[PDB]
TrEMBL record, chain A:
It comes from the Viruses. This is Vp2. It comes from Banna virus.
Length: 50, 50
C-alpha cells in the first residue's frame, strides 16, 4: 500500500510459503543452534521473544 | 690363588650380568606417541543460553 521498494512489512507473517508451513523457532533454541547455516537456507520465524 | 687364599664365598650369579654372546636378550622396544598429537592446557567452560 505504501509503495516501498522491497517492503519489509507484511499484513501478517505467512502461515504457509510454497504450500508448506513456515518453521518457527524460539529465540532460546535459536541461540544454542550449531547447525544454523543449514536452517537459514530454508527460512524460519523467530518468536518467544520481544 | 691355589695356595694363599684360604676361604672362598659364593653367591648365585646376579641377573645384572649378561655374556656378550647373549647380547640379543638385551634388545627391547619402546613406544613414543605420535608427534602430531597436541596436549591441551586450557580448561573447559560450561555455559547455557536457556
Amino acid at each position: 500500500r505504501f509503495g516501498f521498494r522491497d517492503s519489509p512489512f507484511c499484513t501478517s507473517l505467512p502461515r504457509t510459503i510454497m504450500g508448506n508451513d513456515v518453521r518457527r523457532i524460539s529465540y532460546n533454541v535459536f541461540s544454542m543452534m550449531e547447525d544454523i547455516d543449514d536452517v537459514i537456507s530454508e527460512g524460519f520465524i523467530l518468536y518467544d521473544a520481544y | 690363588s691355589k695356595m694363599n687364599v684360604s676361604y672362598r664365598l659364593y653367591i648365585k650369579t646376579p641377573a645384572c650380568l649378561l655374556p656378550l654372546s647373549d647380547y640379543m636378550r638385551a634388545q627391547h622396544d619402546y613406544v613414543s606417541p605420535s608427534s602430531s598429537r597436541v596436549y591441551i592446557k586450557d580448561p573447559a567452560v560450561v555455559y547455557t543460553r536457556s
